[PDB]
């Protein structure tokens, strides 16, 4: 259908479930990883230095 409100009626599925380790709704049900804390990918918790300004 149209790219606007006509194709937004098929919006009945879900792509992210709820994570066990952090409780945030960011668990990818296809790749089986949490996109916020990294659960499923690793035993460590996801942190990147680009999640904040260079502190200078």
Partner RNA sequence: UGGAGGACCGUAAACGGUAUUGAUCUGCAAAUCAUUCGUGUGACCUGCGUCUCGUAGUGAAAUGCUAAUCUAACCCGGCA
Partner RNA sequence: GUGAGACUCCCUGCCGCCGAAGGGGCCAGGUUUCCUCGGCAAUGUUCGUCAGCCGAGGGUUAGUCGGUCCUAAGACGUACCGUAAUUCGAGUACGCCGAAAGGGAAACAGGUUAAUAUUCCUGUACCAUUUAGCGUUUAGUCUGACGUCUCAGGGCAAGCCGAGCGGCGUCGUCGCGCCGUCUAAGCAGCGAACCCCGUGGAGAGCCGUAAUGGCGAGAAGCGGGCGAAUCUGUAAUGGCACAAGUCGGCUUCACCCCGGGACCCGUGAAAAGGACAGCUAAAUGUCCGUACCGAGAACUGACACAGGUGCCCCUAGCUGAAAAGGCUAAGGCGUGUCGGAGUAAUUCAGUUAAGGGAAUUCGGCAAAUUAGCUCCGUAACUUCGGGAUAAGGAGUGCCUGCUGUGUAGACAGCAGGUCGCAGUGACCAGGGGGCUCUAACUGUCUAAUACCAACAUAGGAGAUUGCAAACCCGUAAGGGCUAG
- The footprint of RNA (CB under 7 A) covers 1-15, 29-32, 38, 41-42, 44, 46, 50-54
37 in a labelled binding site: yes
Of the residues 2, 22, 50, 53, which one makes contact with Zn ion according to CB under 5 A: 22
**Interaction partner, residue 20 (RNA, Zn ion, Mg ion, none; CB < 5-8 Å by kind):** none
Residues 14-46 as b/e (b if ≥16 CB within 10 A, e otherwise) read eeeeebeebeeebbeeeeebbbbbbbeeeeeee
3-state class of 49 per DSSP?
helix
33 binds Zn ion (CB under 5 A): no
């Amino acid at each position: 259908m149209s790219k606007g409100t006509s194709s937004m009626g098929k919006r009945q599925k879900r792509t992210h479930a709820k994570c066990r380790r952090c409780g945030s709704v960011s668990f990818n049900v296809h790749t089986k990883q949490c996109t916020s804390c990294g659960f499923g990918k690793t035993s460590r918790m996801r942190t990147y230095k680009w999640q904040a300004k260079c502190k200078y």
